[PDB]
């Protein structure tokens, strides 16, 4: 579902960028937006430490992103770490637009869907699908 995953990332990043003032899948999209919101308000200090791990510049390679997010999933995947992953990406995008590097947003959106598709969807399909995320978080 690489198509659906790219769409989920773009909806979340678009939501997040507009919030900071810079029938199919709709229920997953809505749930994820809510989850990211709850997460950022609950885990402010902890999220600041995650975000401080990486500042994307026009120089930065997907590897550097992959290494910081690998550490988040070092010893497994839970829905709370997946929400952290989406908020992380959001923060990178907001930092990018804030410092007039708006073209990095599309780069970050691709990095996120590739990490989703390769490292996370595999876990999701053994842990109840997006339907389970929706009933947990929606």
């Amino acid at each position: 579902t690489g198509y659906d995953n790219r769409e989920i990332v773009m909806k979340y990043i678009h939501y997040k960028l507009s919030q900071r003032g810079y029938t199919e899948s709709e229920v997953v999209h809505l749930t994820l937006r809510q989850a990211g919101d709850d997460f950022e308000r609950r885990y402010r200090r902890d999220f600041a430490e995650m975000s401080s791990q990486l500042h994307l510049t026009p120089f930065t390679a997907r590897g550097r992103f992959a290494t910081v997010v690998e550490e988040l999933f070092r010893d497994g995947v839970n829905w709370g770490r997946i929400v952290a992953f989406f908020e992380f990406g959001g923060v990178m995008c907001v930092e990018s637009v804030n410092r007039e590097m708006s073209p990095l947003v599309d780069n970050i959106a691709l990095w996120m869907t590739e990490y989703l598709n390769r490292h996370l969807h595999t876990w999701i399909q053994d842990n109840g699908g997006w339907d389970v995320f929706v009933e947990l978080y929606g």
């Binding site: 609950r42 885990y43 902890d46 010893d75 709370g80």
Partner: peptide, 11 residues
């Protein structure tokens, strides 16, 4: 997973 982040407790 072993809890390394405050969000791990809700899972």
């Amino acid at each position: 997973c072993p809890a390394r982040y405050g969000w791990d407790y809700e899972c």
